[PDB]
Design an enzyme around this catalytic site. Structure first.
Site, PDB file in Angstrom:
ATOM      1  N   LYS A  49      64.524  70.604 -31.691  1.00 40.85           N
ATOM      2  CA  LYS A  49      64.917  69.252 -31.893  1.00 40.85           C
ATOM      3  C   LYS A  49      66.315  69.134 -31.107  1.00 40.85           C
ATOM      4  O   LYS A  49      67.087  70.003 -31.485  1.00 40.85           O
ATOM      5  CB  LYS A  49      65.191  69.115 -33.322  1.00 40.85           C
ATOM      6  N   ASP A  52      62.176  67.391 -28.680  1.00 39.80           N
ATOM      7  CA  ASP A  52      61.940  66.364 -29.203  1.00 39.80           C
ATOM      8  C   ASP A  52      63.527  65.678 -29.500  1.00 39.80           C
ATOM      9  O   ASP A  52      64.145  66.431 -30.300  1.00 39.80           O
ATOM     10  CB  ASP A  52      61.270  66.432 -30.447  1.00 39.80           C
ATOM     11  N   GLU A  66      59.754  65.151 -25.588  1.00 37.58           N
ATOM     12  CA  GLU A  66      59.725  63.943 -26.728  1.00 37.58           C
ATOM     13  C   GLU A  66      60.513  63.018 -27.103  1.00 37.58           C
ATOM     14  O   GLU A  66      61.652  63.446 -27.601  1.00 37.58           O
ATOM     15  CB  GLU A  66      58.968  64.617 -27.874  1.00 37.58           C
ATOM     16  N   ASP A 116      56.476  58.813 -29.510  1.00 33.17           N
ATOM     17  CA  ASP A 116      55.865  59.187 -31.079  1.00 33.17           C
ATOM     18  C   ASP A 116      56.157  57.960 -31.715  1.00 33.17           C
ATOM     19  O   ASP A 116      55.351  57.173 -32.004  1.00 33.17           O
ATOM     20  CB  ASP A 116      56.674  60.313 -31.350  1.00 33.17           C
ATOM     21  N   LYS A 141      49.783  61.077 -35.007  1.00 31.85           N
ATOM     22  CA  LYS A 141      50.340  61.586 -36.492  1.00 31.85           C
ATOM     23  C   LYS A 141      49.242  60.788 -37.495  1.00 31.85           C
ATOM     24  O   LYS A 141      49.485  59.727 -37.491  1.00 31.85           O
ATOM     25  CB  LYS A 141      51.952  61.080 -36.789  1.00 31.85           C
ATOM     26  N   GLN A 144      55.209  64.230 -39.713  1.00 26.78           N
ATOM     27  CA  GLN A 144      55.935  63.394 -40.313  1.00 26.78           C
ATOM     28  C   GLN A 144      56.717  63.952 -41.326  1.00 26.78           C
ATOM     29  O   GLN A 144      56.924  63.513 -42.340  1.00 26.78           O
ATOM     30  CB  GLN A 144      55.040  62.233 -40.848  1.00 26.78           C
TER      31      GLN A 144
HETATM   32 MG   LIG Z   1      58.656  63.592 -33.055  1.00 25.72          MG
END
Ligand SMILES: [Mg+2]
Ligand SMILES: [Mg+2]
Lengths: 355, 355
Positions: B151, B180, B206, B231, B255, B283
């Site tokens: 992340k 991401d 992402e 996303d 998702k 999620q």
């Molecule tokens: Mg994502």
């Protein structure tokens, strides 16, 4: 001018029903700004219960403590939460109302003060041509309204094209006409309908088919002469950019119910910079929402050059203002008082609130 | 197999908090299908209170009476309401669960049954490189996970590029890595960060920057070698089409929390037809949501060819299943039982529900 509290009161008023939310921004100066949030689950996905929840649980605690002159901080903080357009818009407009009251200035003048009134349009449709003509005559004779938007989307399309033709035959060039399909027709049906009405001088075509039928929507928009107004498909500036550059929109509907005043200014400036027409729309607003629409629309030349959808509130059996809005000579003036120039009638709120 | 009732129960479980909604679809056969709806106001704008409200007030009454084999009718009816993605997805998945139980078939096999398991990825970041390396070693040694998604989104970007580099230096080509940004960086910062990590063989990028920074987002996507996964910006098939054709996305995150099974099949088929990579995302799902993700991901080759974000539930202090999910050798198998192959523990629900 510091925000000390933000409330959300659900209320319901039958139609001749409006289940809206009264939003109130309280300041440390004893001033209370107001606005309404109309829950439209079929347009934005918000519910009356949901609006009250997001305001009480997220927005209120995030905004208390800010001054009325930190609009961009409020804008940025609310922007962290996705969607919930009318909830955010109501808070923004209530803040502007409070600011106006605090400075003894109308929202319209603070925003730009281009003019003091807007021409009004009326929407009708989904009935027999004879009845539609009768309604148009009544509305025009009663309020002086000279611009009519015909709601379309029925099948066969001839049912709606017959209504538009009847109106043009009756009034001739004495009135302005345009259509809004609310995504009801397929792109193919939309083209056939517009071609059939090619001789009726329709000024705009609004959301005839779903913007989500992406490629066919783009093809349709490129086939039409008049500007194609995007409404429910352009709730944010980013959507305006994507739909306009993608070719699915050639005109923009601005509704203060979903973009308030701060957001609506962003939409107006984007549309003006790109070179696209814009029209003030109606979210089936009550008088509070209508007062907001005219406050914004009168502030700029690009919005006031077109009639605004400002007559829906007439269908409500009652409303919350101490002094009702009045449409005369087909126009609506921005209120003379500070802020939105309106006041909530205590007895009306007590009688219609549902909490 | 007729739906007789649909319920929405809010519950809360602390993290080592998940405030989700348990959705239950009851049939006239005594079967109860289940799924969860994770409220993510900062991604979709839904709140726990709002999800329960839209289900009880709109979706439930609109779906009662339909059979479990009228999915397209349910899909079309729910589609009338805009947004509310997890609420709709939960109902769809609960319906599929009920259908599977009624037919003694797993959701995975009903959807296609391509395979019986998925490789698992783990996400980490926002801490010192040494600590991130330690966590990766622990996760890999404990669960066999060989795919890590870092992340990112902090400034200066060097803080995050240092973390990714440390991970690659430690494991070499033994693990898969990608990033991401959750829209945290500007497009310019995103490019500088990726260029700095050009030698780290990141498989995907992402949502590095906001998709709503439209033009700069498109420029960035065109500058990157690897596929750019969209996303939060592609919650619906129409968004997939607009973002992909517009150049703001070159890969798609699926998702189940937001598109369920019926909607996710629409996304998979659109992405496959257009020729774009797809990855099963997370999620911040509990075990119920994770069971749904694997049920869908294992059904198709295009989704199972990539690792799926299936380890977030490990951070919860407890969950509602009678039999917990287990990750071994870096993989997660789809449940062997009918439907989702899960059962809600009565005592757990009673202890964590908040209604
Ligand atoms: Mg994502
Ligand atoms: Mg409209």
């Amino acid at each position: 001018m510091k925000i000390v509290a933000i409330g959300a009161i659900p209320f319901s008023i039958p139609y001749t029903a409006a289940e809206h939310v009264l939003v109130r921004v309280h300041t440390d100066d004893g001033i209370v700004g107001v606005a309404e949030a109309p829950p439209r689950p079929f347009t934005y996905g918000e519910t009356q219960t949901g609006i009250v929840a997001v305001i009480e649980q997220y927005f209120a605690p995030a905004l208390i403590g800010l001054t009325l002159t930190e609009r961009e901080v409020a804008h940025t903080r609310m922007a962290r939460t996705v969607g919930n357009p009318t909830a955010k818009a109501a808070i923004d407009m209530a803040m502007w109302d409070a600011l106006g009251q605090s400075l003894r200035l109308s929202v319209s003048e603070m925003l730009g003060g281009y003019t003091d009134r807007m021409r009004v349009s009326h929407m009708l449709g989904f009935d027999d041509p004879v009845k539609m003509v009768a309604e148009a005559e009544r509305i025009r004779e009663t309020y002086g309204i000279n611009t009519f938007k015909v709601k379309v989307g029925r099948r066969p399309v001839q049912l709606d094209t017959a209504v538009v033709r009847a109106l043009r035959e009756r009034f001739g060039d004495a009135i302005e006409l345009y259509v809004d399909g609310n995504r009801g027709w397929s792109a193919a049906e939309s083209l056939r309908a517009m071609r059939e009405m090619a001789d009726l001088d329709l000024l705009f075509a609004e959301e005839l088919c779903p913007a989500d039928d992406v490629l066919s929507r783009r093809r349709l928009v490129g086939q039409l002469d008049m500007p194609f107004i995007a409404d429910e498909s352009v709730p944010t500036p980013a959507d305006v950019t994507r739909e306009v550059l993608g070719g699915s929109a050639t005109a923009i509907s601005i509704k203060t119910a979903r973009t308030g005043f701060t957001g609506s200014t962003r939409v107006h400036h984007l549309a003006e910079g790109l070179g696209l027409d814009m029209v003030m729309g109606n979210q089936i607003d009550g008088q509070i929402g209508t007062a907001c629409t005219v406050s914004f629309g009168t502030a700029f030349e690009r919005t006031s050059r077109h009639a605004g959808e400002l007559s829906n509130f007439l269908d409500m059996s009652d409303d919350l203002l101490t002094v009702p809005l009045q449409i005369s000579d087909g126009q609506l003036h921005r209120r003379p008082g500070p802020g939105l120039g309106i006041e909530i009638d205590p007895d009306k709120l007590a009688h219609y609130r549902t909490d």
